[PDB]
From Swiss-Prot, chain B:
Chain positions carrying an annotated carbohydrate: 129
GO biological process, alphabetically ordered: proteasome-mediated ubiquitin-dependent protein catabolic process
Protein name, UniProt field: Proteasome subunit alpha type-7
PANTHER family assigned: PROTEASOME SUBUNIT ALPHA/BETA
Entry superkingdom: Eukaryota
Keyword Plastid: no
GO cellular component, one term: proteasome core complex
Coiled-coil positions: none
Organism, scientific name: Bos taurus (Bovine)
UniProt keywords, alphabetically: Acetylation, Cytoplasm, Glycoprotein, Nucleus, Phosphoprotein, Proteasome
InterPro entries in the cross-refs: Ntn_hydrolases_N (IPR029055), Proteasome_alpha (IPR050115), Proteasome_alpha-type (IPR023332), Proteasome_asu_N (IPR000426), Proteasome_sua/b (IPR001353)
Database matches in Pfam families: Proteasome (PF00227), Proteasome_A_N (PF10584)
Residue numbers of Phosphotyrosine PTMs: 152
Curated annotation (Swiss-Prot), chain D:
UniProt source species: Bos taurus (Bovine)
Quaternary state and interactors: The 26S proteasome consists of a 20S proteasome core and two 19S regulatory subunits. The 20S proteasome core is a barrel-shaped complex made of 28 subunits that are arranged in four stacked rings. The two outer rings are each formed by seven alpha subunits, and the two inner rings are formed by seven beta subunits. The proteolytic activity is exerted by three beta-subunits PSMB5, PSMB6 and PSMB7. Interacts with ALKBH4.
Protein name: Proteasome subunit alpha type-6
Keywords: Acetylation, Cytoplasm, Glycoprotein, Nucleus, Phosphoprotein, Proteasome
Gene: PSMA6
Chain's role: Component of the 20S core proteasome complex involved in the proteolytic degradation of most intracellular proteins. This complex plays numerous essential roles within the cell by associating with different regulatory particles. Associated with two 19S regulatory particles, forms the 26S proteasome and thus participates in the ATP-dependent degradation of ubiquitinated proteins.
Modified residues (Phosphotyrosine): 159
Swiss-Prot record, chain E:
Protein's job: Component of the 20S core proteasome complex involved in the proteolytic degradation of most intracellular proteins. This complex plays numerous essential roles within the cell by associating with different regulatory particles. Associated with two 19S regulatory particles, forms the 26S proteasome and thus participates in the ATP-dependent degradation of ubiquitinated proteins.
GO CC term (a single one): cytosol
GO biological process: one example: proteasome-mediated ubiquitin-dependent protein catabolic process
N6-acetyllysine modification, residue list: 127, 176
Pfam families, A to Z: Proteasome (PF00227), Proteasome_A_N (PF10584)
Species, as recorded: Bos taurus (Bovine)
Keyword Nucleus applies: yes
Protein name: Proteasome subunit alpha type-4
Swiss-Prot record, chain G:
GO CC annotations on file: cytosol; nucleoplasm; nucleus; proteasome core complex; proteasome core complex, beta-subunit complex
Organism taxonomic ancestry: Eukaryota, Metazoa, Chordata, Craniata, Vertebrata
InterPro entries: Ntn_hydrolases_N, Proteasome_beta2, Proteasome_bsu_CS, Proteasome_sua/b, Proteasome_suB-type
Subcellular location per the Swiss-Prot or TrEMBL entry: Cytoplasm; Nucleus
PROSITE patterns the UniProt entry points to: PROTEASOME_BETA_1 (PS00854), PROTEASOME_BETA_2 (PS51476)
Annotated organism of origin: Bos taurus
Origin superkingdom: Eukaryota
Pfam families assigned to the protein according to its UniProt record, in alphabetical order: Proteasome (PF00227)
Similarity comment: family membership: Belongs to the peptidase T1B family.
Designated name of the protein: Proteasome subunit beta type-2
Keywords per UniProt: Acetylation, Cytoplasm, Nucleus, Proteasome
Signal sequence segment: none
Any one GO BP annotation for this protein: proteasome-mediated ubiquitin-dependent protein catabolic process
Length: 204, 243, 233, 245, 251, 238, 199, 236
């Protein structure tokens, strides 16, 4: 109930040498839409992104506190954080509030620095990490996203096939959820470039 | 957790730490405040001009609120601490009371903070003296002075810092209702008092002006130079016509 | 009884601008047993002398070359119980880093945290600075690291260095013997020779302690391995 | 700096001298000798023995309460040397540390671990200025299942070490040289030989023939790991056997 | 007890002075030279490398120059481990401001927060002061490119060109004579820095391994902070040597 | 010297000098006498005036209906101790609904005033007290000192020139027990008068009298209530 | 329930709020200002639980003015909105939570006009127009229907009047008068109250 | 030199060194005189202005503690500020709890309880590190009539018929002793106070050099305006 207060949906998907992360764009309070360009996907590096679903206040708070800790980390160590290290840092941040939890479920998509091996993971609200090799979902329409991703995902997709797969999964999943949608943003992370797209979507 | 008594009485009845903080004040650059009819003027000597220093960063005159400003002599970092505390107090006073502070209120607060630092464990007194000027809601110009011991008084005109004894003698010989009849005359009085101790004839002078209902104004070097030229012209006129 | 310590600093600035207590801690370090670190191309060797004052001492009971993690090793010159304090603190800091990030702490990070602790003891109330210098070795990202941390809390990265008695001569010997591209076996030989330069009497496999760090991790050499190396010399 | 140089308060608080020494720790080492007694510990192949000098000048003193031998746990014994009240505070701390180790980790503390814990606690006194170090030295004996008998010594400096044999107190230098001679000519030390070696070391450095009431003996063996203090009958039997040879 | 062993670090002297602060300033005067120069298109730090020894491992990023956030950097002179404490505090302050306002901290505010920490050590607590002077270079949307200098007393000031550490007074005389306000470019500023370091480091000749140079500039609305490579410093020193030789040939 | 500044420093002779200096603080104060009969306890305090135009300083304080005190030494320390004693008496009446026995109160005072004699940066209380009380054990006179030692007394005098009063009390101690209230007060007044200069005499201005008894709650007589006790005093024998 | 509305134009922000203070069934006040001036170009509009609103708004106002005094320049509207959100979010899980709904209207000399929506949970959103209250349900669709990004300030005032007339027609609550302010490069200007005086 | 002894060290004569030094500090203060009559209490203080540019109205050496209690101070006035604030708080606390005016003696007792609450060890942070360097004259009217109390940094407070504090308190006290009789009127008290202040003041005594205030039964604390001051001083 609390996690569904603002709605929202985030999804990450693994390609052959690339990752994709997509989110709905609606910010609303219960049934009422407020805006249609709420940011849920934040960059934590050149090739590392975190998407946050759940309470919008906790989305913003956790993104800002993670940016705090990540900036300190990357100043103390003269290197960029690895996706596994970012996942551990996020889990520690969430578990610090074990009994007063932040109401967000993060999704992490990235490429290994200096290795460029795709990494995706999801965490629950108290920071239990789950690394997969195909896809992770988070938000208020995880059942629909699971149907779409389990049906459509294939191993070793090139970035264009990956974009089409994650786009169709997100679009058809949020078309079937009342409090998500109003546009979809997709990031495709390759080793040499990042592609950001907004999909044509239903606005009802 | 450091709980040493730093300020203690000496066998002659003296608080040596307070006297040493006053000696620290006496080594600061001269500051002069003159209270006029419609204007309050603050002026600070610059002991040296480095010619490479950003001026905006080393100003000795600062605004505590819209109606209150202060100059200081002594230790710059202690002054920064005191100024920040006074600014917080002014905002909190605007909150809990729906009016701005009187000059005397913020002066009382600053003086009591300094006194607390003369009588509490584990800390030394502040090594600054402050000249606080402003206008009350009644529009009355007010000028106050605080010292490291925690005592504060109201002045028509005053000087603190090094060479303040000669500047105070000059102000006693010169401050008059006719000498503050207009704003320009008050500013010229401040600049003349500063010229009694500063070298290079007005390049080492920072001057600030507060008028009723108006925010603090800082004179740029052009205005200071124009006023100095006016003062020297008046000197020449008096010398030649009377002699 | 009163458990309150002193709250004022015992290390203060002298009129010439020096902190004499830190220089005296350095004198304590300079009176310590010689230690040598050599960073080879594929690992680091830390060699120290432990010449007991009597045959009644059990050599195996106490160790001067210590593991901090599976990939980080420590040795010291100076005062042994201070060293034990710092070893315990370094192990705890490495564990806390692993608990937060779930990867082993990089050597430079652990050196920074240990040096921070040493600085704290140069400034806090009622304490003297530590009377030890640490040589820290590690393997990270397919790369060897060798650091020295001083009682002031300053740390340096070294290719080869010596601490303790006759460390100036040891440094001269190292800089006229060390070269890049050196392998770990040759670095072990050079470290043992550097110890031998300042050693008094016969050097045996029990008189010295040797630890090595490579990709496999950090480990202390058993006295049999040290005896083999000594025979090779 | 110069030999025996001093600057500031380095002779009064635990801060470094210009040579890097801690004079208060050295003074605590002298406080150990202030007690006037000597103890010896010897490790055998299957046993460890502590023998301490027992002095009761006056008959008004209940002798059963004049002991420097203590049991820390069932299986760990100790002999204390130096200032008596400091020694008893260290004994109480050691008993507490052992009990807590058993409670937290579920097995008996090893002797080396207990010695290291006490040594850490005393290093703290060497580094903090508001308190003096204890003027006492602790020798612990025990049986580790993996490594056999254990003799460990910790001193006011916070330094600790394992020993084949060791001594503490006034004549500990002579005792150490005697034990060096005995351990160089290494022969298999049975329980009897270990006890006789300890007793003869004490008697030869103190230059007196002993009596069962003049010394105190505690032992741990592999057969009986429990720490036990020999009664005057057992000590007199050992003394007779030593005197006839 | 406490009273007889207390050093009384935070008390006034009979002349109105704070002795521990003055002795920390003496420590600063001992340390390696750091120089800061502000130009119209950027700002630079040039620091003498005091850790010079053939057996020293090559430094990771820089010996004396620390990035503080995306837009600011600093150089330190004095006690090194105290400088580590202070640089960690600065990074924490900058990130706290970023968390609070979601904007980068203006340079003067960061300097002011650190100087408040320093002053607090000068006034209460009975601890010894930090023996560090700092140079700060930064960019913000309020005042553009900025150079600041802070002392162990907690005093700070902004500068067009300044120097701390060894021979800082002669370097300041050089800067007063040679700096041209409102016309400096990063190329001319780098040349001035090389000449100043040549004079200040009188005993040891300028080689690229004895100095560290970092420049802060703006590109495409981003702040770029870069430590110059060894070859770049070698080229700058070669250019300075050519300038000196030709100026001698003219004379 | 090096041994006379801190209360935590033992002198090589086995003494603590700060405690003795606090004793001197008590000895500087004006004299006061306390004595008891079988049924009454009387404190008589010679008050001192700073100037001719000042009131004489209060010396006798109420503690409880059955307990009063007279003070010598630092007055502010005496007020601290008096507040503590009043709080103890109120605690006893609150918890047990009985008046606190006098000797238990004196033990509490000793415990409270011993603590600052052993802790660094503390000082002894610089006040000596005469405590007059009545309880189930009858009347009691107690004397408390800066050293935290206390004495149960037949009679006592503390303050300046108190040795003459103590000599008089030595002389008439045998008489005190069977005296009636007026005679007991007169004995106390003569002892107090023995500490006076030759020119000065006991007057209703410089004499304060506190009385406690079996049926009499503790009562203080200051200026005009003192005159019935002063009437009938023979001139000083000399 | 109290009504807030903001409409952001190309170079201005127009804000309006109801002027009613109510307790139980009685309008206690009919000229109640729900706008708070943080700076020369920032307005904070706050509604919500009684007591909470003024306490939180004056705390923010004190901190923004203190920032100006300390630094010599003002906070930008985005920085102020984020400072407000951070403080509200910190209070949300503390012992003194504030139940306040906020609009932050501001003008920045470089970023132009800005309008921010904040619910009591302290989620911060940037919107071209926004509204708070039960009356938002009746006027957000009108704003959706007629708003364009290029809307002039007179057309903005007319659109606001349409929204308030809809509130008169359909809203059960009596909200007869509204305070109206506009922020632009020249600061904050008070427009005439939009009123519907009952005969 | 000054840190050899702690702030709570007794001298061999049984005195606290710091309290004695504060007593010495009070001899450097300006002279204040209180006189208690049956018709009221009068207080008079020398302002001791150092410069013509200083505003004498900003010197407040006589303050109102309550409508029925006033206070004259000597010594270090900045120290007296906190004691006076405490006195005001205590009077208002007593009014809040008991719905009556605190007596002068109990207010003086409450202020005197603070005199020796200083120390280095066994104290909360920020606790007083030294004694106060002030002497206070409390003049009030309570149910017992008009009363005048003297408080000194040792924490001793005494009722007084007439008293002088400050730099010239000895000669002024001797003058008070000859001038003062029990049936003195308040007008005579004011005149004698001004006469003695004129005698001991280094400067000439006018309506701006002095503060004078009275408390009377039925009239609140009243600080004499300068016109009233000139009315009294015109014939001295």
């Amino acid at each position: 109930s609390i996690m569904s207060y603002n709605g929202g949906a985030v999804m990450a998907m693994k390609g052959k040498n690339c990752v994709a992360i997509a989110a709905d764009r609606r910010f609303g309070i219960q049934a009422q839409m407020v805006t249609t360009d709420f940011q849920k996907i934040f960059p934590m590096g050149d090739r590392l992104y975190i998407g946050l679903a759940g309470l919008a206040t906790d989305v913003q708070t956790v993104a800002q506190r993670l940016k705090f800790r990540l900036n300190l980390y990357e100043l103390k160590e003269g290197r960029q954080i690895k996706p596994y290290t970012l996942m551990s840092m996020v889990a520690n941040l969430l578990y610090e509030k074990r009994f007063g939890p932040y109401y967000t479920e993060p999704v992490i998509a990235g490429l290994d620095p200096k290795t460029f091996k795709p990494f995706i993971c999801s965490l629950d609200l108290i920071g239990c990490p789950m690394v997969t090799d195909d896809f992770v979902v988070s938000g208020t329409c995880t059942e629909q996203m699971y149907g779409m991703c389990e049906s459509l995902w294939e191993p070793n997709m090139d970035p264009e096939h990956l974009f089409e797969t994650i786009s169709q999964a997100m679009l058809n999943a949020v078309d079937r959820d009342a409090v998500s949608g109003m546009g979809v943003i997709v990031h495709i992370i390759e080793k040499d470039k990042i592609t950001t797209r907004t999909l044509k979507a239903r606005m009802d | 957790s450091y709980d040493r008594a730093i300020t203690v009485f000496s066998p002659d009845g003296h608080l040596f730490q307070v006297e040493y903080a006053q000696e620290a004040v006496k080594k600061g650059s001269t500051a002069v405040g003159v209270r006029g009819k419609d204007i309050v003027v603050l002026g600070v000597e610059k002991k040296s001009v480095a010619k490479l220093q950003d001026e905006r960063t080393v100003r000795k005159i600062c605004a505590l609120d819209d109606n209150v400003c202060m100059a200081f002599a002594g230790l710059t970092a202690d002054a920064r601490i005191v100024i920040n505390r006074a600014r917080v107090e002014c905002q909190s006073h605007r909150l809990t009371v729906e009016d701005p502070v009187t000059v005397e209120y913020i002066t009382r607060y600053i003086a009591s903070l300094k006194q607390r630092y003369t009588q509490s464990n584990g800390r030394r007194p502040f090594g600054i003296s402050a000249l606080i000027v402003g206008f009350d809601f009644d529009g009355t110009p007010r000028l106050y002075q605080t010292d490291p011991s925690g005592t504060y008084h109201a002045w028509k005109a005053n000087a603190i810092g090094r060479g303040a004894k000669s500047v105070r003698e000059f102000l006693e010989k010169n401050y008059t209702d006719e000498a503050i009849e207009t704003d320009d005359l008050t500013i010229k009085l401040v600049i003349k008092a500063l010229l009694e101790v500063v070298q290079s004839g007005g390049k080492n002078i920072e001057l600030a002006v507060m008028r009723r209902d108006q925010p603090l104004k800082i004179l740029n070097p052009e205005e200071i130079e124009k006023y100095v030229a006016e003062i020297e012209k008046e000197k020449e006129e008096n010398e030649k016509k009377k002699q | 009884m009163a458990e309150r310590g002193y709250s004022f600093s015992l290390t203060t600035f002298s009129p010439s601008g020096k902190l004499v207590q830190i220089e005296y801690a350095l004198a304590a370090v300079a009176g310590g047993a010689p230690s040598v670190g050599i960073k080879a191309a594929n690992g680091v060797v830390l060699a120290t002398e432990k010449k007991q004052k009597s045959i009644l001492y059990d050599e195996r009971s106490v160790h001067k070359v210590e593991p901090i993690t599976k990939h980080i090793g420590l040795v010291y010159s100076g005062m042994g119980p201070d060293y034990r304090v710092l070893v315990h603190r370094a192990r705890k800091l490495a564990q806390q880093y692993y608990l937060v990030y779930q990867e082993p702490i990089p050597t430079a990070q652990l050196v920074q945290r240990v040096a921070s602790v040493m600085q704290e003891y140069t400034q806090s109330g009622g304490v003297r600075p530590f009377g030890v210098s640490l040589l820290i070795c590690g393997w990270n990202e397919g790369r060897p690291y060798l650091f020295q941390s001083d009682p002031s809390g300053a740390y340096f990265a070294w290719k080869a260095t010596a601490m303790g008695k006759n460390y100036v001569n040891g440094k001269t010997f190292l800089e006229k013997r060390y070269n890049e591209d050196l392998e770990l076996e040759d670095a072990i030989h050079t470290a043992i020779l550097t110890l031998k330069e300042s050693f008094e009497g016969q050097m045996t496999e029990d008189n010295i302690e040797v630890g090595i760090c490579n990709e496999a991790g950090f480990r202390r050499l058993t006295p049999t391995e040290v005896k083999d190396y000594l025979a090779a010399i | 700096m110069s030999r025996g140089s001093s600057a500031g308060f380095d002779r009064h608080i635990t801060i470094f001298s210009p040579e890097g020494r801690l004079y208060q720790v050295e003074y605590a080492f002298k406080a150990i000798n202030q007690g006037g007694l000597t103890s010896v510990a010897v490790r055998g192949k299957d046993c460890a023995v502590i023998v301490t000098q027992k002095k009761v000048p006056d008959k008004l003193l209940d002798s059963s309460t004049v002991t420097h031998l203590f049991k820390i746990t069932e299986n760990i014994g100790c002999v204390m040397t130096g200032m008596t009240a400091d020694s008893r505070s260290q004994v109480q701390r050691a008993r507490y540390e052992a009990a807590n180790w058993k409670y937290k980790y579920g097995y008996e503390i090893p002797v080396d671990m207990l010695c290291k814990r006490i040594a850490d606690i005393s290093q703290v006194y060497t580094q903090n200025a508001e308190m003096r170090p204890l003027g006492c030295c602790m020798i612990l004996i025990g049986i580790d299942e993996e490594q056999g008998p254990q003799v460990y010594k910790c001193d006011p400096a916070g330094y600790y070490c394992g020993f084949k044999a060791t001594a503490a107190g006034v004549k500990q230098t002579e005792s150490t040289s005697f034990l060096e001679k005995k351990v160089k000519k290494k022969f298999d030390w049975t329980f009897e030989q270990t006890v006789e070696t300890a007793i003869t070391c004490l008697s030869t450095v103190l230059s007196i023939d002993f009596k069962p009431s003049e010394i105190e003996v505690g032992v741990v063996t592999v057969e009986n790991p429990k720490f036990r203090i020999l009664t005057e009958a057992e000590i007199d039997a050992h003394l007779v056997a030593l005197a006839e040879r | 007890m406490s009273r007889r062993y207390d050093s009384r670090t935070t008390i006034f002297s009979p002349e109105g002075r704070l002795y521990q602060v003055e002795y920390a300033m003496e420590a600063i005067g001992h340390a390696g030279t750091c120089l800061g120069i502000l130009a119209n298109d950027g700002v630079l730090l040039a620091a003498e490398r005091r850790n010079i020894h053939k057996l020293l491992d090559e430094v990771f990023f820089s010996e004396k120059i620390y990035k503080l956030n995306e837009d600011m950097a600093c150089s330190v002179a004095g006690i090194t481990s105290d400088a580590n404490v202070l640089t960690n505090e600065l990074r924490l302050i900058a990130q706290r401001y970023l968390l609070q306002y979601q904007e980068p901290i203006p340079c003067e505010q960061l300097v002011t927060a650190l100087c408040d920490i320093k002053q607090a050590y000068t006034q209460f607590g009975g601890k010894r002061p930090f023996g560090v002077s700092l140079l700060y270079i930064g960019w913000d949307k309020h005042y553009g490119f900025q150079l600041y200098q802070s002392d162990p007393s907690g005093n700070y000031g902004g500068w067009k060109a300044t120097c701390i550490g060894n021979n800082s007074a002669a370097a300041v005389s050089m800067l007063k004579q040679d700096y041209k306000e409102g016309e400096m470019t990063l190329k001319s500023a780098l040349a001035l820095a090389i000449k100043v370091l040549n004079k200040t480091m009188d005993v040891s000749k300028l080689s690229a391994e004895k100095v560290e140079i970092a420049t802060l500039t703006r590109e495409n609305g981003k702040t770029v902070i870069r430590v110059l490579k060894q070859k770049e410093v070698e080229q700058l020193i070669k250019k300075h040597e050519e300038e000196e030789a030709k100026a001698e040939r003219e004379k | 010297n090096q041994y006379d500044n801190d209360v935590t420093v033992w002198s090589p002779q086995g003494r603590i000098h700060q405690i003795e200096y606090a004793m001197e603080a008590v000895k500087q104060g004006s004299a006061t006498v306390g004595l008891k009969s079988k049924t009454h306890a009387v404190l008589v305090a010679l008050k001192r005036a700073q100037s001719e135009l000042a009131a004489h300083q209060k010396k006798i304080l109420h503690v409880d209906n059955h307990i009063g005190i007279s003070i010598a030494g630092l007055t502010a320390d005496a007020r601290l101790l008096c507040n503590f004693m009043r709080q103890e008496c109120l605690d006893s009446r609150f918890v047990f609904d009985r008046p606190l026995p006098v000797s238990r109160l004196v033990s509490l005072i000793g415990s409270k005033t011993q603590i600052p004699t052993q802790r660094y940066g503390r000082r002894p209380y610089g006040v000596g007290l005469l405590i007059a009380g009545y309880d189930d054990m009858g009347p009691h006179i107690f004397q408390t000192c800066p050293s935290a030692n206390y004495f149960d007394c037949r009679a006592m005098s503390i303050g300046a020139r108190s040795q003459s009063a103590r000599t008089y009390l030595e002389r008439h101690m045998s008489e005190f027990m069977e005296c009636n209230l007026n005679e007991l007060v007169k004995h106390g007044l003569r002892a107090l008068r023995e500490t006076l200069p030759a020119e000065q005499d006991l007057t209703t201005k410089n004499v304060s009298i506190g009385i406690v008894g079996k049926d009499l709650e503790f009562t203080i007589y200051d200026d005009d209530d003192v005159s019935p006790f002063l009437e009938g005093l023979e001139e000083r024998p000399q | 329930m109290e009504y807030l509305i903001g409409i952001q134009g190309p170079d201005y922000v127009l804000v309006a709020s109801d002027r009613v203070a109510a307790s139980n069934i009685v309008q206690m006040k009919d000229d109640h200002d729900k706008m708070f001036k943080m700076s020369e170009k920032i307005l904070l509009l706050c509604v919500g639980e009684a007591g909470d609103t003024v306490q939180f708004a004056e705390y923010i106002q004190k901190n923004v003015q203190l920032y100006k005094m300390r630094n010599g320049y003002e906070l930008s509207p985005t920085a102020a909105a984020n400072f407000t959100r951070r403080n509200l979010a910190d209070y949300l899980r503390s012992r003194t939570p504030y139940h306040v709904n906020l609009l932050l209207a501001g003008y920045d000399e470089h970023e132009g006009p800005a309008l921010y929506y904040m619910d009591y949970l302290a989620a911060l959103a940037k919107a071209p127009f926004a509204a708070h209250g039960y009356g938002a349900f009746l006027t957000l669709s009108i704003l959706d229907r007629y708003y364009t990004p290029t809307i002039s300030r007179e057309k903005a005032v007319e659109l606001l009047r349409k929204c308030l007339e809809e509130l008169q027609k359909r809203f059960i609550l009596n909200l007869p008068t509204f305070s109206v302010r506009i922020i632009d490069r020249n600061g904050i200007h008070d427009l005439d109250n939009i009123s519907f005086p009952k005969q | 030199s000054e840190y050899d002894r702690g702030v709570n060290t007794f001298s061999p004569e049984g005195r606290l060194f710091q309290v004695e030094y504060a007593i010495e500090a009070i001899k450097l203060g300006s002279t204040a005189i209180g006189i208690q009559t049956s018709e009221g209490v009068c207080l008079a203080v020398e302002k001791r202005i150092t410069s013509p540019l200083m505003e004498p109205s900003s010197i407040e050496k006589i303050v109102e503690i309550d409508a029925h209690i006033g206070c004259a101070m000597s010594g270090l006035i900045a120290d007296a500020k906190t004691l006076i604030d405490k006195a005001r708080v205590e009077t208002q606390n007593h009014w809040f709890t008991y719905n009556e005016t605190m007596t002068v003696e109990s207010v003086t007792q409450a202020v005197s309880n603070l005199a020796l609450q200083f120390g280095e060890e066994d104290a909360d942070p920020g606790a007083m590190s030294r004694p106060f360097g002030v002497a206070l004259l409390f003049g009030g009217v309570d149910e017992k009539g008009p009363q005048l109390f003297h408080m000194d940094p040792s924490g001793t407070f005494v009722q007084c018929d007439a008293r002088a504090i400050g730099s010239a308190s000895e000669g002024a006290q001797s003058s008070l002793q000859e001038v003062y009789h029990k049936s003195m009127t308040l007008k005579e008290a004011i005149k004698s106070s001004l006469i003695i202040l004129k005698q001991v003041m280094e400067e000439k005594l006018n309506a701006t050099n002095i503060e004078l205030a009275t408390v009377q039964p039925g009239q609140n604390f009243h600080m004499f305006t300068k016109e009233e001051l000139e009315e009294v001083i015109k014939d001295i």
